[PDB]
Amino acid sequence: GSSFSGKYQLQSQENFEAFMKAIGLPEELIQKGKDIKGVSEIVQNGKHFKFTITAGSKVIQNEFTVGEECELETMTGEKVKTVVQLEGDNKLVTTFKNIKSVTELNGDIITNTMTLGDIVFKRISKRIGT
Numbered sequence: 001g002s003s004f005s006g007k008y009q010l011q012s013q014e015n016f017e018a019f020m021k022a023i024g025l026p027e028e029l030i031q032k033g034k035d036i037k038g039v040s041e042i043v044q045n046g047k048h049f050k051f052t053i054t055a056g057s058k059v060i061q062n063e064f065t066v067g068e069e070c071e072l073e074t075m076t077g078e079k080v081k082t083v084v085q086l087e088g089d090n091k092l093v094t095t096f097k098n099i100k101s102v103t104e105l106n107g108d109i110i111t112n113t114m115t116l117g118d119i120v121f122k123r124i125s126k127r128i129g130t
């Protein structure tokens, strides 16, 4: 099962700066990263996920098995222990550091919503070939 598999590129995002400041991303990376159209590569094999996020020079690789403890490297470099769940074939949900993350695939469009208190950081990405 491979619902999420593919390569997607950011089209637009809301509240990037406010969110990244809140979480402790260095200001130099915030300013150089706010206009980056990052690429996310996902390989789904049943419950087993691997994803690679590229933004400029910076590459972050992560993996998890749905419903199990995993260790996710966040944008700051902090690795967090959490559990990622599926809510249907096309929705991944997790919470770490009081952030709720929801990743939802609709055809070729992935919407990622990260909520930290009143800050709702929304990213919309579009499939880019294979």
Ligand SMILES: CCCCCCCCCCCCCCCC(=O)O
Residues within 6 Å of the ligand: 028, 029, 030, 032, 033, 036, 038, 053, 055, 056, 057, 058, 075, 112, 114, 123
């Ligand atoms: C060293 C060159 C500067 C570029 C590095 C800036 C870091 C950009 C990272 C922010 C992109 C946000 C990715 C989050 C993806 C997600 O929603 O899970």
Ligand SMILES: CCCCCCCCCCCCCCCC(=O)O
Residues within 6 Å of the ligand: 038, 039, 040, 042, 051, 053, 060, 062, 072, 073, 074, 075, 084, 092, 094, 101, 103, 110, 111, 112, 123, 124, 125
């Ligand atoms: C890297 C920080 C951890 C993010 C927590 C969500 C983990 C489950 C989602 C994995 C799919 C990744 C899709 C990212 C799409 C995007 O770039 O906005």
